[PDB]
Amino acid sequence: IDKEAMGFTYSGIRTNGATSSCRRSGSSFYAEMKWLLSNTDNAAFPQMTKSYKNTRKNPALIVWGIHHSGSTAEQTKLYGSGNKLVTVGSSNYQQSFVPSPGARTQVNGQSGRIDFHWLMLNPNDTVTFSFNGAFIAPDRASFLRGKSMGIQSGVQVDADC
Amino acid sequence: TRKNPALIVWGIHHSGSTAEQTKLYGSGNKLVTVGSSNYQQSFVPSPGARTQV
Amino acid sequence: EKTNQQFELIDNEFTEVEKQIGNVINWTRDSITEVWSYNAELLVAMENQHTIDLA
Numbered sequence: 424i425d426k427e428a429m430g431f432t433y434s435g436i437r438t439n440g441a442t443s444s445c446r447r448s449g450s451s452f453y454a455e456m457k458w459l460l461s462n463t464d465n466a467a468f469p470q471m472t473k474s475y476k477n478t479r480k481n482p483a484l485i486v487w488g489i490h491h492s493g494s495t496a497e498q499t500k501l502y503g504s505g506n507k508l509v510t511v512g513s514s515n516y517q518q519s520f521v522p523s524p525g526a527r528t529q530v531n532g533q534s535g536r537i538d539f540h541w542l543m544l545n546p547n548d549t550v551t552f553s554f555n556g557a558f559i560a561p562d563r564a565s566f567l568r569g570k571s572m573g574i575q576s577g578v579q580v581d582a583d584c
Numbered sequence: 585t586r587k588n589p590a591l592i593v594w595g596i597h598h599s600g601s602t603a604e605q606t607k608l609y610g611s612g613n614k615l616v617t618v619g620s621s622n623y624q625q626s627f628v629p630s631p632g633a634r635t636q637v
Numbered sequence: 638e639k640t641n642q643q644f645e646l647i648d649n650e651f652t653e654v655e656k657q658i659g660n661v662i663n664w665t666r667d668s669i670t671e672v673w674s675y676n677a678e679l680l681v682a683m684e685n686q687h688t689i690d691l692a
């Protein structure tokens with residue numbers, strides 16, 4: 424995988440969303456995703472639209488996340504009140520997503536979930552992320568390198584045979 | 585009424601903006617419900633900007 | 638003389654695939670296994686008749 428930065432800028436919203444499940448010298452998050460929040464708790468969230476153009480000569484593995492919070496007092500704490508939406512479009516793709524809060528079972532100490540989705544942006548195509556909350560934004564798009572093969576095993580690797 | 589299956593096709597419009605969906609179908613939350621004796625689904629439009637095709 | 642056709646992984650031993658696609662893969666792999674178990678047992682039994690008869 425060859426990671427290539429997207430260069431998104433964020434105007435007036437928080438970005439350092441962290442959690443206690445991802446322990447990396449304290450409380451952190453994913454290394455290639457951002458958790459876009461409001462400026463403080465229970466504050467509003469402006470409607471945004473960010474775009475990326477695949478300039479290279481190969482398909483680009485784009486990945487974004489949707490946050491399904493644990494409560495309805497948790498979704499409003501981090502993206503304000505109201506009904507939220509994430510719209511994702513391309514020249515070969517169109518879908519849209521809506522967060523769905525609610526309690527569920529504790530995994531790693533939390534009851535919220537993050538749904539990761541993906542598409543392969545064709546060369547000289549454009550992806551667009553309309554959102555107003557519950558969006559785990561991408562940071563670096565990914566590109567494939569060549570040909571290999573993947574196995575699943577339980578024994579040790581030997582470099583002699 | 586005929587003695588053969590019928591290929592029914594409908595479309596759902598996902599407009600480019602929220603000022604575009606309200607221009608052509610009014611304000612509010614919209615819905616399309618489609619039912620049959622062997623089928624049941626429902627659809628909701630989702631406006632928002634995307635790339636120009 | 639070994640084949641040059643590379644077969645890759647379509648199942649998953651850790652996180653199981655969807656059940657309707659997990660049964661089409663399982664039905665197809667048992668069908669092909671019946672073919673290569675028949676052809677191996679036929680070829681060995683046929684070349685034992687040829688080895689005995691040539692000597």
Ligand SMILES: *[C@@H]1O[C@H](CO)[C@@H](O)[C@H](O)[C@H]1NC(C)=O
Nearest residue numbers: 653655656657658659660663
């Ligand atoms: C397919 O067969 C394997 C045995 O190799 C089994 O572990 C797996 O559960 C089967 N899949 C389904 C969907 O039955």
